[PDB]
Each structure stands twice: as structure tokens, then as C-alpha cells.
Structure 1
Amino acid sequence: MARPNPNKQVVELNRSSLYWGLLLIFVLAVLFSSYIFN
């Protein structure tokens, strides 16, 4: 539209979603490490 970009958006990640992401990634590690090491 103008010289600046009109679609300027902010991203959000609450501490709860941080906790789901960390559990998810670490659980994928616990699950899959035995198989990657094989």
C-alpha cells in the first residue's frame, strides 16, 4: 500500500506453548534416540 509494508504482524508464544514445544522435542528425543543410535 504505502512505502512501509501494510501487513506487519507480531508472533506470540506464551510460556504454556513453550512448555509444549519443549516437552514435544525432548519426548521425540527420548523416543527416537534408541532408534537413531540403533
Structure 2
Amino acid sequence: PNPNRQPVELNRTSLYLGLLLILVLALLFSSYFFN
């Protein structure tokens, strides 16, 4: 058993912020991907 294990967390606010970042980045770059 490795003692260097740690639990990972991501709260709901961080989920909302990350989803907003990803969706806005996709909305920005989609026109350039389609070109």
C-alpha cells in the first residue's frame, strides 16, 4: 500500500466554472475549426 495516495476533489462551483470555460472556448474556437 502506497502511503503517497491523496483524495482528489472538485466542488460544484469548480465544475460550473470549468464547464463555462470549456463551453465558451468551444463557442469561440468552433468557427475557426469549421473555418
Q: Give your verdict on TM over 0.5.
A: yes
Residue aligning to 2:8: 11
1:37 is matched by which residue type in structure 2? F
1:26 partnered with 2:23? yes
Stretches of structure 1 that go unaligned for 5 or more consecutive residues are: none
Runs of 4+ in structure 1 off by over 6 angstroms are none
Report percent identity of matched pairs. Answer: 80
Q: How far apart, CA to CA, are the structure 2 residues paired with 1:8 and 1:28? A: 33
CA RMSD of aligned residues (A): 0.5
Q: How far apart, CA to CA, are the structure 2 residues paired with 1:15 and 1:34? A: 29
What TM-score results when the alignment is normalised by the length of structure 1?
A: 0.85
What TM-score results when the alignment is normalised by the length of structure 2?
A: 0.91
Aligned residues: 35
| Higher percent of residues as helix | 2
Stretches of structure 2 that go unaligned for 5 or more consecutive residues are: none
Cα offset, 1:8, TM superposition: 1.3
